[PDB]
Design a protein around this nucleic acid. Sequence first.
DNA 1: CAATCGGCTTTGACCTTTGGTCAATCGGCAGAT
DNA 2: ATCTGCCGATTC
DNA 3: GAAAGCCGATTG
Lengths: 165, 158
Amino acid sequence: HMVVAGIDPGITHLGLGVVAVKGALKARLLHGEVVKTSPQEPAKERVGRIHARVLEVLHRFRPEAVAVEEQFFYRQNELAYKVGWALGAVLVAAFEAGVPVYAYGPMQVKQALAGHGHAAKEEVALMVRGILGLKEAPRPSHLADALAIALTHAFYARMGTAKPL
Amino acid sequence: HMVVAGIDPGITHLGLGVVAVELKARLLHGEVVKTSPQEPAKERVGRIHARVLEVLHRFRPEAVAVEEQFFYRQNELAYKVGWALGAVLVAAFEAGVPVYAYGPMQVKQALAGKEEVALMVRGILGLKEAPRPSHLADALAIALTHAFYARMGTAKPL
DNA sequence: CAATCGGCTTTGACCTTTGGTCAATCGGCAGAT
DNA sequence: ATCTGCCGATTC
DNA sequence: GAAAGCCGATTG
Ligand SMILES: [Cl-]
Ligand code: NA
C-alpha cells in the first residue's frame, strides 16, 4: 500500500491527483484537482497559488512520492519556460515536504499503462478507469494525465526502475 | 530611497543583487547562488527559493526585477531557467514584492547608446573594479534597469 | 461562471530596389589556479 | 575551493 | 514528419 501524487505541469491548468496502491495495478483515487490561473494575474501570484495548493495537498495526504510528466519537446520556447515555472513551484513544494520527485515522459506512460508503445488517448484513459475502478472517465484532460503519471510512477517503482529528478 | 533587487535567473548560477537609490545609487548586497547537477532537482530549486526569500526579508525591497531572455537554442534550457524563475516568484509571492521583467534589449539601451554597459554599472554604483562573476553584474544591471524605467512610469510588471 | 474554440510557434540589426543573412541562449563537465 | 574553458542542443 | 500548451475570445 503506497500513496503517489501525480502532476501534469502547466501554468494555465495544473493536473493534481493522489492515488493509493500491491498485486496488479489496482489503485484507489484519493484526490483530484486542476489548478487554474489566468494571464491576468501577476506571474508571482499564478505560480504563487500553484505552490500553495500543492503544499496543502502534500501535507494532507502525505504521499510517498510526487511524479511529474516531462514533455520531450515544446514547440516554442516560451511554452517550455512557463511550464518550467510551474514545475518550479512544484519542486520547491516537494522540497518543503521532503517528498521525493520522479519524472516520466509521454512514452513511458504509454508503455506502462496500455502495455503498448503507442496507445491512443482513448486507450490509456480506459486503462486508468480500470486501475481506479471509476464510473466515468476522469475529466479534464490534464487531470486524466495527472492520474496516469501517478500510476506510471507506481508501475516502474514495482520494478525498481524509478527515475528521480 | 528606492531599494530594488535584481536577478539573473539560472539553475546553476543565479545572480542576486540589492540596490538603494536617491540620478544614481549605491550597493547593499550581492551574491551568486550556485547549485550542482549532482543534487536532486527538488533540492536545487529548494535552495534557490530559500535563499531569495532570505534576501527579501532582510532588505525589504520595493521591487524584484528579473531578466528575461527570449532566445534559447534548446528547450531543456528554457525549461530549467523556468524552474529557477518559478522558485523566485514563489518567494516574491511569499515576500509580497511585485516582480518586473526586462529583456536584454531594454537593458543594453537603458544604459549605453556589449561590455559598454557592464562597465557602466561599476560607475552607476561606484566600484574599484567591475563585479564578478558575470552573473552578478547581470543581476545588478537589471536592478538598475528597473529603477530607471520606474522613474519614467514605464515599469513593466510580470 | 466554465468551458470550447482557433492561431501561433524567437527577436533585432545590418545591408544586399529588396528581402537576404547572422547571432544570441545556458547547463554540464573537465581541467587548472 | 573557485574559476575558466569548449560542446551541444528532441524523440519515434 | 509527427508530438502540446498558452492566450484571447466566444458561447450557454
Ligand atoms: Cl485542461
Ligand atoms: Na507584479
